[PDB]
């Protein structure tokens, strides 16, 4: 019955920065809030309980605040080991629900980099298999947010694409992303124009890569 919403969904930080993550509860829950840190490929770690009580062994650079419906995790003097996803959790109900927030990613800040965009039609060999995959590649961009929208013959596509994104690169701090549109051979055969449109902060206007079948 209690829902926790974190904001923002993602934050960029440089070492030394102060970062603030907010958790809003759908009802008043006094100070019954925990905060956890999760780096990919390692077990989650408790930081704070009772909204503001620092767990033993945890750096005092982490501070928790708030009571009622609004809670904050502040990370002071951010260190490289702090790039991770952070979760709030409520522990208010006597019959436990222990609901978590959706998580907030904290990544490493770098200069904004627009993606290089590439499109691939399906191979002839794949059509014989009965499927056509069209792939739109967004390469080496930052920040992580990117909107990719497909159009076939000027009609917006819904429900027939899937995205995959790399982890942040350890050397250059960029991301890459694929968006793959899947249709049957029968549908690829009909329509004429295939286009992916990309919106990224590093561009003041969206970029479209397109092709005509043939």
């Amino acid at each position: 019955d209690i829902q926790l919403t974190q904001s923002p969904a993602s934050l960029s930080a440089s070492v030394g920065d102060t970062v603030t993550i907010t958790c809003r509860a759908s009802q008043s829950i006094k100070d019954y809030i925990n905060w956890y840190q999760h780096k990919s490929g390692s077990a989650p770690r408790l930081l704070i309980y009772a909204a503001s009580t620092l767990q033993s062994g945890i750096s005092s650079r982490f501070t928790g605040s708030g009571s009622g419906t609004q809670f904050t995790l502040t990370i002071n003097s951010l260190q490289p080991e702090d790039f991770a996803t952070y979760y709030c959790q409520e522990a208010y109900n006597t019959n436990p629900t222990l609901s978590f927030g959706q998580g907030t990613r904290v990544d490493k800040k770098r200069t904004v980099a627009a993606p290089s965009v590439f499109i691939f039609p399906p191979s002839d060999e794949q059509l014989k298999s009965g499927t056509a995959s069209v792939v739109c590649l967004l390469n080496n961009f930052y920040p992580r947010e990117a909107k990719v929208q497909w159009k076939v013959d000027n009609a917006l596509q819904s429900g027939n694409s899937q995205e995959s994104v790399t982890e942040q690169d350890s050397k250059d701090s960029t991301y890459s992303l694929s968006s793959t549109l899947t249709l049957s051979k029968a549908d690829y055969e009909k329509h004429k124009v295939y286009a992916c449109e990309v919106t990224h902060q590093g561009l003041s206007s969206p970029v479209t890569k397109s092709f005509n079948r043939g």
């Binding site: 077990a43 590439f118 890459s176």
Partner: protein
């Protein structure tokens, strides 16, 4: 040296049952709350359940998504926590983490008897995949460099590795001789219940038609190895 190690994970079919185990080291297991949290692919953390110490009656409690289907039990004599699952569904696919929990007393007078409950120590997790799919090796298709996959003077090329089960596949280029500029994407689960990924590389356009590019795809669960030459 508090340590928790989960096991029992793996592939299982919908409707079936499976037990996960967690062994605790370095603490007085009998005296603690113990529990389970999970994380589905691409999703956040989700509490599964907890069990009280035997001295207080060993009541088990559960998250909303699993009540009626799972039982948590403990064997203090072996420092072992169990998650007995039944009636499994595809959406139970997740990493399952064992936790040692604590309750810290609330000190405000009017809330005496209340506690702050938290997951104090977590294991690294065991993966459970619930699926009706059968083993299938991948089909490998070229992502050919052409004018539509050119950006400035850079060309992109790759391989689409489609319709395999279960994970994982590994991809290299030119038997490992090509690593600069390569991105192999995390796999996605398709509607069919089969996985798919792509591996791409960017190269100078001037390199095409002199330099050979071959993607090497290995899928150990099917014992298949595929080399695909990618030409413009």
């Amino acid at each position: 040296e508090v340590q928790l190690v989960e096991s029992g994970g793996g592939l299982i079919k919908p409707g079936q049952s499976l037990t996960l185990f967690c062994v605790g080291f370095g603490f007085n297991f009998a005296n603690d709350w113990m529990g389970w949290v999970r994380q589905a692919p691409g999703k956040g953390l989700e509490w599964v359940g907890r069990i009280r110490r035997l001295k207080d009656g060993a009541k088990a409690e559960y998250g909303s998504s699993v009540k009626g289907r799972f039982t948590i039990s403990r064997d203090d004599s072996k420092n072992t926590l169990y998650l007995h699952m039944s009636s499994l569904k595809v959406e139970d696919t997740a990493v399952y983490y064992c936790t040692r929990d604590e309750g810290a007393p609330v000190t405000r007078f009017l809330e005496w008897g209340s506690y702050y409950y938290y997951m104090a120590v977590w294991g690294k997790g065991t993966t459970v995949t619930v699926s009706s799919a059968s083993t299938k090796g991948p089909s490998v298709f070229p992502l050919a460099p052409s004018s539509k996959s050119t950006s400035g003077g850079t060309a992109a090329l790759g391989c689409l590795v489609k319709d395999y089960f279960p994970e994982p596949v590994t991809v290299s280029w030119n038997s490992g001789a090509l690593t600069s500029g390569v991105h192999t994407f995390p796999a996605v689960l398709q509607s069919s219940g089969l996985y798919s990924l792509s591996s791409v590389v960017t190269v100078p356009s001037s390199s095409l038609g002199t330099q050979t590019y071959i993607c090497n795809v290995n899928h150990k669960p099917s014992n298949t190895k595929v080399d695909k030459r990618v030409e413009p």
